[PDB]
C-alpha cells in the first residue's frame, strides 16, 4: 500500500513498454502477462465481496484469451517459421489471433465481462486502469494489420456499436454506463485498422484523455445517476459545466474534440469506396449519445436531489490531470485538422 503500490502501478507502465518495444512474439505474451499480475492487486485493494467476484471474472476472461494468442504464436512456428511481429501469413493463424484480441478490444461477442468488472472496482483511481489497459493490445494490431481477414474484423466493429449502443440504455450504475461507453468507442477502433492504420492511434489519444477526465470528475463520490444528480444543487456548481462539456464530447458533436474521431474514420473509409457500412456506423452512433444525454440531465435539470446534509468544507482531491486534459477535451477543433499527421 505505501511503497509497493507505486511499484505495482509502475509494472503496468513497464508492461506496456515491453509490448510497445518488441520484435518477438513471445515478448508481447510476457507483456500481456505483466498486466495480469499487476491490475488484479489494484482491483482488490479494500477487499470487498463485490471486488472478489470482479477480480476472478477479469482473470478468467482474459488469461484464457491470452492463451488463444499463444496458439497463434505457435502456428507462426508451424507455418512461415520466423518469430517476427509483422505478418501472421496463415489465415488459420489470424482467426485465433483476432478473436483473442477481441476479448480486449473487439468486444462484439466478448463484452460480457466489462460491466461486472468496471462496477466491481471500489476505487475511482482503479477505473482509469481499464481505459488505459486497452492501449497495449492496440499496438499489437497496429503491427499486424495485413493478412487478417477483413470479413471477421468489420463484424467486430459493426456489432460492437449495436450492443454498446443498446447495453447502456437499461443501466443506472455510473460505472456500468462508462463500461458500455468503452464498448461503443472500441467499435470505431476495429474499423480503422483495415482502412488506413494512421489516425487509429489518435482515436485512442482522443478516447483516453476524454475517459481519464470523466472518472476524475467522479473523485467526489458517485456510483449511480441519482448520486451524481446531487452535484450542482448541494456541492460545487461550476464543476457540473465541465461534466456537461465532457459528456457532450463523448457523443460525436462538431463544436467539441469528440467529432475528430468521426471526422477521419468516415473520410478514410469513403476513400476505399464504401457507402453502406459507414451509414450504419452513423445511425448507431446516435444510440451512444443517449446515455450521455440522460447524464447531462443531472447537470441541467432541477430533479430535486437536495438532501438533508449540506457540504461547506472545501474539497481536496488528488486530480492528476483534471485541469490540462479537459481543455484539450473541450475546445480542440480549430487546432485539430492538421493533428492526424502529428500522431504518426
Amino acid at each position: 500500500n505505501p511503497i509497493i503500490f507505486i511499484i505495482i502501478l509502475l509494472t503496468i507502465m513497464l508492461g506496456t513498454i515491453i509490448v510497445m518495444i518488441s520484435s518477438h512474439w513471445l515478448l508481447v505474451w510476457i507483456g500481456f502477462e505483466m498486466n495480469m499480475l499487476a491490475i488484479i492487486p489494484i482491483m482488490m485493494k479494500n477487499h470487498n465481496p463485490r471486488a472478489t467476484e470482479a477480480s476472478t471474472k477479469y482473470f478468467l476472461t482474459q488469461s484464457t484469451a491470452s492463451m488463444l494468442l499463444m496458439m497463434a504464436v505457435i502456428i507462426n512456428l508451424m507455418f512461415s517459421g520466423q518469430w517476427t511481429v509483422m505478418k501472421l501469413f496463415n489465415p488459420m493463424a489470424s482467426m485465433l489471433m483476432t478473436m483473442a484480441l477481441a476479448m480486449k478490444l473487439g468486444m462484439a461477442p466478448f463484452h460480457f465481462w466489462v460491466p461486472e468488472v468496471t462496477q466491481g472496482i471500489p476505487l475511482s483511481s482503479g477505473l482509469i486502469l481499464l481505459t488505459w489497459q486497452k492501449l497495449a493490445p492496440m499496438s499489437v494490431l497496429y503491427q499486424i494489420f495485413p493478412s487478417i481477414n477483413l470479413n471477421l474484423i468489420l463484424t467486430l466493429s459493426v456489432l460492437s456499436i449495436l450492443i454498446g449502443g443498446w447495453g447502456g440504455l437499461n443501466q443506472t450504475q455510473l460505472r456500468k454506463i462508462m463500461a458500455y461507453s468503452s464498448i461503443a468507442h472500441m467499435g470505431w477502433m476495429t474499423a480503422v485498422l483495415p482502412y488506413n492504420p494512421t489516425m487509429t492511434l489518435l482515436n485512442l489519444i482522443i478516447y483516453i484523455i476524454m475517459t481519464s477526465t470523466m472518472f476524475t470528475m467522479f473523485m467526489a463520490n458517485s456510483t449511480t445517476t441519482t448520486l451524481s444528480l446531487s452535484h450542482t444543487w448541494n456541492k460545487t456548481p461550476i464543476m457540473t459545466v465541465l461534466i456537461l462539456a465532457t459528456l457532450l464530447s463523448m457523443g460525436g458533436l462538431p463544436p467539441l474534440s469528440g467529432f475528430m474521431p468521426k471526422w477521419m474514420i468516415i473520410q478514410e473509409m469513403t476513400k476505399n469506396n464504401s457507402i453502406i457500412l459507414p451509414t450504419f456506423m452513423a445511425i448507431t452512433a446516435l444510440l451512444n449519445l443517449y446515455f450521455y444525454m440522460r447524464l447531462t440531465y443531472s447537470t441541467t435539470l432541477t430533479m430535486f436531489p437536495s438532501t438533508n446534509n449540506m457540504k461547506m468544507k472545501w474539497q481536496f482531491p488528488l486530480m492528476k490531470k483534471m485541469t490540462f486534459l479537459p481543455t484539450m477535451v473541450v475546445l480542440s477543433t480549430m487546432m485539430l485538422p492538421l493533428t492526424p499527421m502529428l500522431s504518426v
Partner: protein
C-alpha cells in the same frame, strides 16, 4: 505514409530533414496559447478560488507548457505534410505512364428543362 521507408524509426524530431523553417507567431499558435489560458481559468472552478481571470499567478505555467509542447507538435505537422507531398510528386515522375493529360475540349452535355 504509415510506415517509414526513408526516415529512421523512433525519433522525436525530424533531424534528417530539418530544412523547412518553423512558423513564427502563427495564427495556430495563438489558439493553443488561448487553450493554455483556458486551462488556467477552469482550474479555479474545480479548486474553489476567487476570480477566474484575476486569480492565482500559476496560470503562466499552463500557458508556457501548452506553447512549448504545441511548438514541437506543430513542427511534426509541417514535416509530415511535406514528406507526404515529397513522396507523391516523386511517384508520378518515376512512373510517367500512370498519369495522363487532357486539356481543351468541346463536348455535348444534356440540358435540363425548367
Amino acid at each position: 505514409x504509415x510506415x517509414x521507408x526513408x526516415x529512421x524509426x523512433x525519433x522525436x524530431x525530424x533531424x534528417x530533414x530539418x530544412x523547412x523553417x518553423x512558423x513564427x507567431x502563427x495564427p495556430r499558435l495563438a489558439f493553443v496559447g488561448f487553450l493554455g489560458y483556458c486551462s488556467g481559468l477552469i482550474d479555479n472552478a474545480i479548486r474553489r478560488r476567487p476570480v477566474l481571470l484575476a486569480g492565482l499567478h500559476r496560470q503562466l505555467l499552463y500557458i508556457t507548457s501548452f506553447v512549448f509542447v504545441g511548438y514541437y507538435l506543430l513542427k511534426r505537422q509541417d514535416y509530415m505534410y511535406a514528406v507526404r507531398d515529397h513522396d507523391m510528386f516523386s511517384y508520378i515522375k518515376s512512373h510517367x505512364x500512370x498519369x495522363x493529360x487532357x486539356x481543351x475540349x468541346x463536348x455535348x452535355x444534356x440540358x435540363x428543362x425548367x
